[PDB]
Amino acid sequence: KHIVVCGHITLESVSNFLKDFLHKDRDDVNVEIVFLHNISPNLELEALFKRHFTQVEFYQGSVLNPHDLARVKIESADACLILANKYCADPDAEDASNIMRVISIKNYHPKIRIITQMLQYHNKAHLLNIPSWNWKEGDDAICLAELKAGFIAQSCLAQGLSTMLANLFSMRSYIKIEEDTWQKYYLEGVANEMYTEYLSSAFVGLSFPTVCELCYVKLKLLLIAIEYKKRILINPGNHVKMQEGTLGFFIASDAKEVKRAFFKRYDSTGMFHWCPSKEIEKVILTRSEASMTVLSGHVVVCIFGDVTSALVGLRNLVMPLRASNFHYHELKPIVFVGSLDYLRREWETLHNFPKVFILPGTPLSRADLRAVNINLCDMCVILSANASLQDKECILASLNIKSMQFDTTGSNIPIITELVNDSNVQFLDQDDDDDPDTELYLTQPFACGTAFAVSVLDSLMSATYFNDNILTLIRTLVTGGALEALLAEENALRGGYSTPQTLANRDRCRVAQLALYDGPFADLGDGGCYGDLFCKALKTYNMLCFGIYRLRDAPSQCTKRYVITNPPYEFEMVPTDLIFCLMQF
Amino acid sequence: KHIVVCGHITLESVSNFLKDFLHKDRDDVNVEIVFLHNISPNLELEALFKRHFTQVEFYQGSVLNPHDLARVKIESADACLILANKYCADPDAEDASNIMRVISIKNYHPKIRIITQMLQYHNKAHLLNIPSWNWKEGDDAICLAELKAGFIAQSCLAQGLSTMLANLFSMRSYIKIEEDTWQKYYLEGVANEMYTEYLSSAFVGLSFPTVCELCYVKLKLLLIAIEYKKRILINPGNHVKMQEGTLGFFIASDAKEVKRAFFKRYDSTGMFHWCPSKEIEKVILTRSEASMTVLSGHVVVCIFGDVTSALVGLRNLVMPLRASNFHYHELKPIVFVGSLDYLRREWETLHNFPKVFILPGTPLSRADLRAVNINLCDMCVILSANASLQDKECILASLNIKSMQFDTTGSNIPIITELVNDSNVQFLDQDDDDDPDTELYLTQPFACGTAFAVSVLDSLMSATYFNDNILTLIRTLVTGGALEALLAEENALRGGYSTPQTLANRDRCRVAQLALYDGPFADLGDGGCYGDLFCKALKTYNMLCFGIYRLRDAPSQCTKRYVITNPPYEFEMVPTDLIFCLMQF
Ligand SMILES: [Ca+2]
Ligand SMILES: [Ca+2]
């Protein structure tokens, strides 16, 4: 078996792809990776590669040349992966180019699995027009815009989820730092990767909750979702019972570890909160009108950009924040602080969502910022519209906010800065240890969920090759809902009257972050074991706890909290801890 | 005798020119071709050429240099041909440049025959301002914009006509594929080229129809038009009788084969349907206003482009669709799906034509597409406004439409994609055999009239040198009407009250495609010979049948039909066949 990787192939992209391919995964001996570029050979740089991995071959040529496709033997190949220029000049033009490859690869041999990256959502739709494109077979398209947005959105609900859900996906091994610092605990979690496995015949008929306990208690495998016979269910309630050989998504250290588990108020779907399309000027707040309202528990997304910028795809940020699993009362209002000229062009996708607001002005003016009462928000998202040196602004905005005093203090505000250049992470937190060479996942600002780069998702490519499900899990988890045709035929979203079959869909779980201090399970804090809590939390409310969001201190000063994924049954808690979890509805 | 070729002379252009010059034509020994470029000599590449053809000489220099013109001896030369940069950066600038050459060549020696290519129609007019320019002598200008448009227009009336009328013009020989596939039948037709010949004294006084039968039955030469003594008549009625030595246009395999034939509701002209100039906003349909009307039997021309694009010259697409040979009832309404900003600038030429509509929006949104009820149209033209890699859009649009389901199916819609790069043909039909090297005329999508490139017309250059008439035939045939001064003085077109002399001009024949199933001559189908049908069809209704538009199957599935030009008197029909023909009025 062999695969064909093509599209934007750079030294950096190849090296990154190879790392993620061959780590803890069960078998790597099987697949030969054949890269196909059209750039200058650079035989020397390639020469060494071939020596380290005997599974790697380089050929130049186009994906649009029937001879070259035959030369690389695309027809026989297990799958073909099309890498995109994430940091492209014109995003629309890039997708346009990539779509053509898909068309071509399908033209040569239709029965091929194609994994492809997409920069803009709206373009992802086009892929369905291609005859040979099988959404139901292996063909899948990783939309970078929609996922980047969703990950940041999921952080508004539970701060730090973005980086927790990212480290979980990138294949990485255990490090075991000897000295006592947060690094130790953070990395002990990082060591995770999320694997797919079939449930043992033993579990058949049991309730998911009881199965989940057995897996965690008897095996130390944190189970999060089943694949009912098809639709997938994340943390089902106690009623769900196992159907012969069910497929389960586990979060364990190594791939071999998981083997052991074998012994009109709504959208047409009723998934998202629909609202009558509103005219943009009805939403625009004056600086005063905004300062008048004391907003809190809201999301302040402040975007830089002018009329001639790439569309960030704000649709995908608000959508998961408007899922039906939250009550209208619970919904967080969203305030965009940007240029009106920029906003309006994107606006057309958002008019349907409720509690959306625009305050024209720059994220660098405190006047605009004080007006929207940042001190009070649950999350402040800082985005840079697309030369990457010009993201200097985001750092400035971030630093600005940290140095305010509301009368609370600026440094204690939930911020999440989207960075374009992983190197720039050094700057946003100014007490951390800095080095340009140090990987992003290891930096403090990332560990805490203060920062997030498009870079992080590149790992998904290989990961979604191995398990189709993985990609459909995350997309489902991150965006709220998923179907595509209603969404595809029109980019504008249809809203309908609720049927008892639609009001039924509200039953999906939801991400939340909880405290031990006010907790019903509070008694466990102040020294109790996480293992003892987890089970209690599960059986009593059907809650899944998969992470502690601890302060970076074990004297006390800072508020910054870092992420610990899937801690062991014997893990000492503290009163200050917070719990990442999936609650029922 | 010798000729001077100048202007845009590339390796590709030269090789193409030489192929079309020296094939089946009666005598090639007579003419020496002298190329005059101004690019870097590249003596080596040229060296070989001179060795294959002893009729070819290369000289560098300008056409604007009196010395160089004398050196190439332009004054003695039979004719001078000016090739243009079809795939130019700025079309207007290219014509500007070419016109200057014409001016210069005329300045040096006025009594010269000049054949020249023009990219935009509006510029073609300017050539009349040049004193030495003789529209009545040999001087003729092949306007690429007007012909490309007309060929596509002619396909709306009879699908596949574009490629039938193209293969007919490019000098090509018989191939005789042994195996039974559509290629065989298609190529047996392709082997045609349309030649000019004088009628034998024998035919004098007979009716065209009876002459036509004799030519087809006794000689196997399909005759299509006479040149009455001057004006030319395509398929005249039975009344027209031969005047001594008449000139006739025949469609035969070889040039020597033809030798054997020797043994206010209207425009000022009353040629085209005039309508009071309408204000653009009166024509613009909302998406709703359009979805409201169930349009069918119409043409959906959907153009990509913004305000800063080259003008496609839509005038020339609608004009042949608005000829007076059709009743107002019979007229096909035209819907443009594009950017309003782009359209309005072109619009000013169209306000005069009736049943014209604009639906602002992109050909990639199904909303806009479903609104205009594509399922129902007789033809859907896909155009790309002018870097040629950016025609990727046309393929996308084409694929989009094929994958829709109206509730009919998307794949069964009459589409014609204008391609800029002959190579890209591979992509539009995804069941055909693909190879970049394979010539365009041989590709399935072209064989069927699904695709059409500006490339195809390059053959005309040499062909119109040999017979002035040929060019005036096609232009007359393709655009409906032809005179130039009324059209030239103002680009806007004058409409007048009809006189009985103008209402007389409506008598021109018309292209149409007919079925055997519903046919009056239906009985001949299901096994009968085409020869037996042809004559019957001619004598009974004065119809000329010149082609079968057969399905590509001889089990059944596909709807795609390919073109067979001038089939023999002994040709087996089928019920599924269609007939290309010229009907009377
Ligand atoms: Ca720092
Ligand atoms: Ca093809």
Give a three-class secondary structure readout of B509-537: CEEEEEECCCCCCHHHCCCCEHHHHHHHH
Cβ–Cβ below 8 Å for B402 and A131: yes
Cα of A435 vs centre of ligand 1, distance in Å, is 9
Query: Which of A107, A126, A129 is facing B434, going by the closest CB pair?
Result: A107
Interface membership of A132 toward B (CB under 8 Å): yes
Interface membership of A490 toward B (CB under 8 Å): yes
8 A C-beta contact, residue A448 and residue A562: yes
Cα of A147 vs centre of ligand 1, distance in Å, is 27
Query: In the structure encoding, which two tokens stand for residue B438, read together?
Result: 């394979």
How far apart are alpha carbons B468 and B473 in whole angstroms?
Answer: 9
Nearest ligand to residue A108 Cα: 2
- Contacts (Cβ under 8 Å, ≥6 apart) of A84: A7, A8, A94, A95, A98, A116, A117, A118, A119, A144
Which residues on chain A are in Cβ contact (under 8 Å) with B403?
A: 128-131
Q: Which residue has the tokens 């068309």?
A: A103
Q: Please state the three-class secondary structure of B4-56 as a single string.
A: EEEECCCHHHHHHHHHHHCCCCCCCCCCEEEEEECCCCCHHHHHHHHHHCCCE
Q: Which of A342, A351, A280, A356 is nearest to A493 (CA)?
A: A351
8 A C-beta contact, residue A582 and residue A224: yes
If one counts every other C-beta atom within 10 angstroms of the C-beta of residue A42, the result is 12
> Which amino acid, A50?
K
**Ion ligand 2: protein residues whose beta carbon lies under 5 Å:** A 107; B 426, 430, 432, 434
Angstroms from B374 CA to nearest CA on chain A = 15
If one counts every other C-beta atom within 10 angstroms of the C-beta of residue B256, the result is 12
Cβ–Cβ below 8 Å for A107 and B400: no
How far apart are alpha carbons A114 and A137 in whole angstroms?
Answer: 10
Interface membership of B365 toward A (CB under 8 Å): yes
8 A C-beta contact, residue B430 and residue A132: yes
Cα of A150 vs centre of ligand 2, distance in Å, is 37
Nearest ligand to residue B431 Cα: 2
Query: In the structure encoding, which two tokens stand for residue B386, read together?
Result: 């002018």
What B177-182 contacts at long range (C-beta under 8 Å, 24+ apart), as own/partner pairs, is B180/B554, B182/B447, B182/B550, B182/B552, B182/B554, B182/B562
Query: In the structure encoding, which two tokens stand for residue B103, read together?
Result: 């001016």
Tell me the binding residues of A: 32, 55, 57, 107
Judge residue B539's burial from the number of C-beta atoms within 10 Å of its C-beta, 0-12 exposed, 13-18 middle, 19 or more buried. middle
Q: Which residue has the tokens 């155009």?
A: B383
What is the tally of structural domains in chain B? 1
Query: Which of B389, B392, B426 is facing A107, going by the closest CB pair?
Result: B426
- Taking only residues 419 to 448 of chain B, the set having a beta carbon closer than 8 angstroms to any beta carbon of chain A reads 426-427, 430, 434-436
Q: Please give the backbone phi and psi of residue A146, each rounded to the nearest 5 degrees, phi first.
A: -70, -35
Query: Which of A67, A130, A491 is facing B399, going by the closest CB pair?
Result: A130
How far apart are alpha carbons B243 and B205 in whole angstroms?
Answer: 7
One DSSP character per residue, A190-248 reads HT-EEEEEEPPGGGTTSBHHHHHHHHHHHS--EEEEE------EES--TT-B--SS-EE
One DSSP character per residue, A557-572 reads ----B--EES--SS-B
Cβ–Cβ below 8 Å for A96 and B396: yes
Interface membership of A348 toward B (CB under 8 Å): no
Q: Please give the backbone phi and psi of residue A112, each rounded to the nearest 5 degrees, phi first.
A: -120, 145
Cα of A364 vs centre of ligand 1, distance in Å, is 21
Strands B79-83, B113-118: pairing kind: parallel
Cα of A106 vs centre of ligand 2, distance in Å, is 9
Strands in B26-168 per DSSP E: 32-37, 56-60, 79-83, 113-118, 140-143
Interface membership of A106 toward B (CB under 8 Å): yes
Which residues on chain A are in Cβ contact (under 8 Å) with B390?
A: 96
8 A C-beta contact, residue B299 and residue B383: no
Cα of A577 vs centre of ligand 1, distance in Å, is 25
Which residues on chain A are in Cβ contact (under 8 Å) with B399?
A: 103, 129-131
- Contacts (Cβ under 8 Å, ≥6 apart) of B138: B79, B113, B114, B468
Cα of A432 vs centre of ligand 1, distance in Å, is 5
Interface membership of B306 toward A (CB under 8 Å): no
8 A C-beta contact, residue A250 and residue A221: yes
Length of chain A: 585
Q: Please give the backbone phi and psi of residue A241, each rounded to the nearest 5 degrees, phi first.
A: -120, 145
> Which amino acid, B334?
I
Q: Which residue has the tokens 């492809």?
A: A116
Angstroms from A361 CA to nearest CA on chain B = 30
Query: Which of B367, B403, B436 is facing A129, going by the closest CB pair?
Result: B403
Length of chain B: 585
How far apart are alpha carbons B132 and B111 in whole angstroms?
Answer: 7
Cα of A37 vs centre of ligand 2, distance in Å, is 22
CA B319 to chain centre: 14
Tell me the binding residues of A for Ca(2+): 107
CA A522 to chain centre: 30
Which residues on chain B are in Cβ contact (under 8 Å) with A491?
A: 365
Coarse DSSP helix, strand, coil percentages of chain A, rounded to the nearest 5 percent: 35, 20, 45
Q: Which domain holds residue B410?
A: 1-585
Rg over alpha carbons for chain B, rounded to the nearest Å, is 24
Using what technique was this structure determined?
X-ray
Query: Which of A65, A103, A128 is facing B427, going by the closest CB pair?
Result: A103
Q: Which of A105, A106, A99, A148 is nearest to A125 (CA)?
A: A99
Query: Which of A99, A104, A107 is facing B396, going by the closest CB pair?
Result: A99
Which residues on chain B are in Cβ contact (under 8 Å) with A96?
A: 390, 392-393, 396
How far apart are alpha carbons A255 and A250 in whole angstroms?
Answer: 10
Dihedral in degrees, nearest 10, Cα atoms A160, A162, A163, A165? 110
CA B96 to chain centre: 24
